[PDB]
Write a protein that binds this ligand. Structure first.
Ligand SMILES: CO[C@@H]1O[C@H](CO)[C@H](O)[C@H](O)[C@H]1O
Ligand SMILES: [Ca+2]
Length: 145
């Protein structure tokens, strides 16, 4: 029914600080994002990364799936910091999602884009236009469905 991105191997990957963490935040904690009702939300699966980050996945041999789905936001390990980022999703060189500026307490966003007839998925986490300081971006429950 679904395959998580952390169960797949990227073609290429980069991160601005530390290393990309599969099923964990940048600092190796459970991925947490700010909920819509004041809560801290935990995600068992996903990708923890840091601005500036770019990750590219091939969708070859994955024709079973209709959508790419993920939550995005500043990882809540960095709550109450200078954290400021944006998330961009690309499918075949076309931008299909842009989060805009997200800071420490910005409510998580919920991505769902159709992947039929698509070959390449690209994830971008940018630095909010100031610096990469505190810029822990997490992709919560990142999967193909
Ligand atoms: C001075 O703040 C630090 O900035 C770094 C990026 O340069 C990382 O985000 C660290 O987690 C953060 O604590
Ligand atoms: Ca920033």
């Amino acid at each position: 029914t679904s395959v998580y991105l952390s169960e797949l191997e990227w073609k290429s990957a980069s991160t601005g600080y530390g290393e990309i963490q599969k099923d964990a935040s940048c600092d190796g904690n459970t991925i947490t994002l700010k909920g819509e009702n004041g809560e801290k939300v935990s995600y068992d699966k996903g990708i923890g990364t840091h601005a500036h980050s770019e990750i590219v996945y091939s969708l070859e041999g994955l024709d079973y799936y209709d959508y790419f789905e993920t939550f995005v936001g500043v990882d809540q390990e960095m709550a109450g910091t200078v954290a400021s980022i944006s998330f961009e999703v690309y499918l075949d060189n076309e931008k299909v999602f842009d989060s805009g500026l997200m800071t420490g307490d910005t409510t998580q966003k919920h991505v769902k884009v159709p992947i039929a007839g698509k070959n390449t998925l690209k994830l971008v986490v940018k630095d909010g236009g100031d610096s990469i300081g505190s810029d822990h971006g997490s992709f919560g429950d990142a999967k193909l469905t």
